Amino acid sequence: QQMGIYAVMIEKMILRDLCRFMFVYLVFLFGFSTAVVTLIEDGKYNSLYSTCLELFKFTIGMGDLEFTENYDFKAVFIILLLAYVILTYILLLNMLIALMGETVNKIAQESKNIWKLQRAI
Amino acid sequence: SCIDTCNSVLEVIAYSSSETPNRHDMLLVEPLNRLLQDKWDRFVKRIFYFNFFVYCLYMIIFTAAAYYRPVEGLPPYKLKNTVGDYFRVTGEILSVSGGVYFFFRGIQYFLQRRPSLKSLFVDSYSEILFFVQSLFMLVSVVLYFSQRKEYVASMVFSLAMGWTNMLYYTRGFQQMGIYAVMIEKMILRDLCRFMFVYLVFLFGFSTYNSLYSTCLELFKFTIGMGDLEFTFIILLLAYVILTYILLLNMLIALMGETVNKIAQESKNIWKLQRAITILDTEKS
Ligand code: NA
């Protein structure tokens, strides 16, 4: 019963909150990565994949803020990175936690009923 | 009569002054919601989807043109007899055309609506954001033809604004449209309060012999990258305890509270946004 309901909650969270969050997060990440890589003149990080990975490192608490220096207008680079950090890390990821708490609050009976139907199947 | 079209009721509610007591709630009245849904499902869903597709194509072409910008120095850059250079230049022309299109669309909005300088910067955030993206694109063009490399700075701010503006089209889908209304309400209320207090604390504790370097080192703590030995211990521990362990968790808690109380208000605001979209499509 307990693990069953926990798995049902995981399913519900993956289908609603993770989905909505991943769409908005991927849009922001691609936009800010296309901006940063365009600003970069050349070097190791002059590819879309490398810059996307560098900006995704921020989501997992491993962002550098100085991962490259092959650019002009350091102010432009710093402002872009700070905007990306404030929009994703400090806002969107905490909002995901807050929306996950609301979902937990509202899907107890639904999650127990779904588990019971699964066991009936 | 005088509901669908006339001062029609729908055009009165949608284009209200943002001081109206129940601007978001008057659309819940029985006939109006069902009329707006009818207009949506009949013709405004298809028109809006076409607009979204066109905007996605525009952003893809702009991203491709900016990605393959030449690095030679002191524009303008002479076109070579290469197919790739012919694709890049046509993409750039399309990007500038879209920027001009959005600039003129913002001017037309500010003219026909005449915002009162408070609802200008308190409501209609989408119009201002698209207009500012267009402004960045036009400034980029002006700098580009002035032989200035700062054109790239204006262009990359236009690109990040244009990709972040794709969140406008989340309206037209209820779940994503309400999530985007909830993102707006978090940004205006919780992020603002937290950022004011957080910036005060950061500047105080920061005040590596330069202010910028120490501010960056102390901001690294917020993103889970703080060193604690980057170059004193009591100051760093006080800053960590007051920002990382207290204020950032308090932000999460307050965000949870907001989400709990804005559920109904977030749906009403999304419905009003879609009504505005349906009226704009009808008029144009
Ligand atoms: Na970390």
Residue numbers in the entry:
A (entry chain D): 560 to 603, 627 to 703
B (entry chain A): 385 to 390, 393 to 593, 627 to 650, 659 to 711
Pull verbatim passages from the article behind this deposition.
The capsaicin- and heat-activated receptor, TRPV1, has served as a model for deciphering lipid modulation, which is relevant to understanding how pro-algesic agents enhance channel activity in the setting of inflammatory pain. Identification of a pocket within the TRPV1 transmembrane core has provided initial clues as to how phosphoinositide lipids bind to and regulate the channel. Here we show that this regulatory pocket in rat TRPV1 can accommodate diverse lipid species, including the inflammatory lipid lysophosphatidic acid, whose actions are determined by their specific modes of binding. We captured several states of TRPV1 ranging from channels in which the VBP is empty to those bearing different bioactive lipids, including distinct phosphoinositide species, brominated phosphoinositide analogs and a pro-algesic lipid, lysophosphatidic acid (LPA). Together, our data show how the VBP accommodates a range of bioactive lipids and how occupancy of the site corresponds to the structural status of the pore.
